[PDB]
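Quick entry between incubations.
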Amino acid sequence: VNGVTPPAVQHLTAEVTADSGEYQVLARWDTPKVVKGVSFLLRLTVTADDGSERLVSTARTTETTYRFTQLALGNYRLTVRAVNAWGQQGDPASVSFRIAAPAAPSRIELTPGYFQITATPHLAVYDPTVQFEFWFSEKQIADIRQVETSTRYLGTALYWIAASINIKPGHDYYFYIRSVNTVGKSAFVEAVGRASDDAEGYLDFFKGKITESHLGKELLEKVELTEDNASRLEEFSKEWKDASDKWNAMWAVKIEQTKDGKHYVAGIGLSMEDTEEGKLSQFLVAANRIAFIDPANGNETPMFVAQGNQIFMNDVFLKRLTAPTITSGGNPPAFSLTPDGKLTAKNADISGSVNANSGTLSNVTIAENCTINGTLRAEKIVG
Amino acid sequence: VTPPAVQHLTAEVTADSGEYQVLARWDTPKVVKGVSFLLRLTVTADDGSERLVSTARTTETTYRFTQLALGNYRLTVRAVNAWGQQGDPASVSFRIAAPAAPSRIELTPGYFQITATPHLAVYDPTVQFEFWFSEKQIADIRQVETSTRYLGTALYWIAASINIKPGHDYYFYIRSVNTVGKSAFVEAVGRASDDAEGYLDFFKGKITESHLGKELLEKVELTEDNASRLEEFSKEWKDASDKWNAMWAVKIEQTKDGKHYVAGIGLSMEDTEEGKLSQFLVAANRIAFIDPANGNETPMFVAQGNQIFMNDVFLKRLTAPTITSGGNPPAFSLTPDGKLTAKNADISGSVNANSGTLSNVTIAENCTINGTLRAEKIVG
Amino acid sequence: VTPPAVQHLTAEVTADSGEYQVLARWDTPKVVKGVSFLLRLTVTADDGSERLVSTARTTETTYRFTQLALGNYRLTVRAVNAWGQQGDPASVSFRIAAPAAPSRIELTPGYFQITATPHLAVYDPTVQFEFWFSEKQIADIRQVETSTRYLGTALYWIAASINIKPGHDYYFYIRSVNTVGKSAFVEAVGRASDDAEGYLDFFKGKITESHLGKELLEKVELTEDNASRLEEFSKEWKDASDKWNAMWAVKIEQTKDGKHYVAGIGLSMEDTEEGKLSQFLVAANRIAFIDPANGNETPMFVAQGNQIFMNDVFLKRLTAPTITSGGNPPAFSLTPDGKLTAKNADISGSVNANSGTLSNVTIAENCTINGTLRAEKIVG
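Done. Structure below.
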């Protein structure tokens, strides 16, 4: 025999890829004669900023190919050996590569809307060749790797405006944004967002949708009865193809009058019109006052009512409310809460604590420990 | 194993097929791959003793008893498995004999309405009531059924309709009605609450005194026990005062067990001093709003018996003489009379108050006093 | 040589036949040349011992003792050979008097039903239960069985009435029954389930299990791509229960890239096991109530899926397990745990508190520390 030491490899190549994200590297080369194998021992180290090394992996194969899987982006150096059956290590070779990626978006801002949400993201420094890729989600995803799968891919711009019928107010939505450009893709920056919440801020929105439809441009905005004094109490069902060449439907009762040189109308209409992506139903009732009742044993008082923007309910169990304003009624409100935060009360019992930044009383009475860690001042004392 | 208990037993009294019949229905907690049920119906003797009448062993969830005469009865069910392990029993006492005379009567006024409710000298849950309304006193009971208003037949009857106005003393003549028959009539002397307003009592009042009100109520046509009627129409007419009256309604009525049943939907504008005033009035026992996107089926808005359910909602200002969170102990709650109730409250500012009732205090800095201090055990 | 004790000694008491009795049953152990059962029944006297009552010798594995009185008893059985050498004894112990009425009663309030499940301290396997429901707590107890709807007699009840509607209390009168007697009565209180989203899937229960659902939803009428059908139909017709079912509806369906979109509302009045029920189903992707008053074009009530949006509103009570002012930092809130949030609390009255933590407090009158003052610094 001869324990001949294995002369080092040449034509050592590293190929960098990003198959499932989390970049890998495929190490490959060629060799002349081998004895009871002649192993290949590999080890791969990243140069830190200052020129010192992290150990990243090792590898004990026999063929002239290998792959390194969970990777971070860093300046990597891969060294390959050649040990023989006895275990006498040949001279090394080494190759160096990088994985340069765009800088993350440093802060992304998230102004609400009406059934919509804007992310406008910004980088720590200005970058001319950066454009961000946005993926939207409704549930905080576990880790910042499976976003490539479990989060819808919105699109890619300098910003995005997610509108739909499904971004619903007071349910937070997490935006996942990664910077992209010619050089690669960064990590995923996460952020939360909302919809505006503001109640009366939704009603104008709805008015706007309503108006731009079959029932808006039929039940109202219809210009018949051109003679003072009439009652064209009308009721039909029309379905037809549109300029988009899709079917649309409405069936209504339109009633309307002319008296004293002025017009009126009231209008129970039901439809389903097309949209770019699907069909939106709708059941729009315009009238000077709406109310319902349970007629049980002679009872005729409506269960609810509403008439030019004031709606009259007996008792409700709400899943959750959310008004900026509350009153006992009257003009000493027995209690109140206002858009500023003030909880106007009368007699305010609390089974728990009151972490208040301050007090402002007359007549106090503590039945156990009264601690003072500040500058206590007093006039007359008898205890 | 024993099959579980008997759930939802009932003690009812039918006379549909020409004579009296006692049905019951029983549903199973969890169903045990071959549940059987013994059920025992027995009578009370003149000495108040127990006599067996009918024992049925069946594997079905309902049964009927036919050719059953007058008297008081007791009905039990047990569950028996294949191996023969009779379970816990569930037993209800019922009666085939009735019409007692109502002992007291309860009267609650209201805006254009007045509640008459029965009180029977002994309770009996196999009974409903006929109500008759009179504007003039009827001395003899014979024309009480003939020369008055047929209010109807039900449980708790409130007087509220077009013929009812504040300030007149109305009368009630009511009796007990069942499968057996009806009793000696009883009277009461009662008055509507004129106008107390609530905040919808004005809207009821507005509603009653309208053409929709007259159409979709107090039209009591089609009165054939266990029959019914539908109409979808639009009757436009010119009124007394030389003006139009438009209207469109969908009205359904039925009659069953002597009692009158109805609902529907109206859209109308009448004539007021200014001119026309449009509408949509629904009356019914449950209304209910649905959104079928994705084939989701859960309402967002369900109202029955003057109450609402609603999922999430938003608002420009609540106006509300009381709130809770719900709970036998409600997590928080403002009272109409100004009291607040909470397990906690963390204010990021200043607590302007009159007084204090604090078992513990922990003031972190300066405490200015301009009055008198009284501290038992003092350190410093 | 010695025969063994009688095993599995089982006693059941009854007085149904006219007055009080005990059935004693057991299983014979293996003996020599025949066997006789000796039974000795004693009652616990005033002294804590047992006064001897009756003694019999028999030869059948079951026996009866008649015309005994009320008390806790020791019944001893022995196995005797032909020679008179009696085996080991087996003495059972079992109790008699008016059974003890539950110590408690627990209500898991279900969505539109109570589940009132009693319990005692010292458990007797051989007492049943009577249950009673009422809407009004009664002054006395002696007229409950004269003034209360009879739920009946089981181990636990679930109580239902169709009109049940959450979030009011209703009062309970339970008792233990057995062969001895109906116990003294017992009180309790309860309500129903409070949550709304629960009701709304509940009501979805009620919605879908109707011919309303079965026509509106559940039927997949139409097929080929770009299908659209609009129809107005009515029927009041015979069903299997010999009832008329009465329904007018509006319905639309459409097919776009295959997927099938329905919407449609309808008044109806179908039949229930108690009476005909008159119920609204509006369904659409979105319903708005909007007003025509003076070129009015803005809503006051927009229900888009699981949400509602509204304007200024007017309630009478509220039960809402969260209310927040909007904004990521809300002006105020109450999450369900009863924690309040705010920035001013001008309770112009007593803060009836359990803790305060007020960094820099002003007092301008009497401070009366019943506990421990504790001050780093004082300049008084």
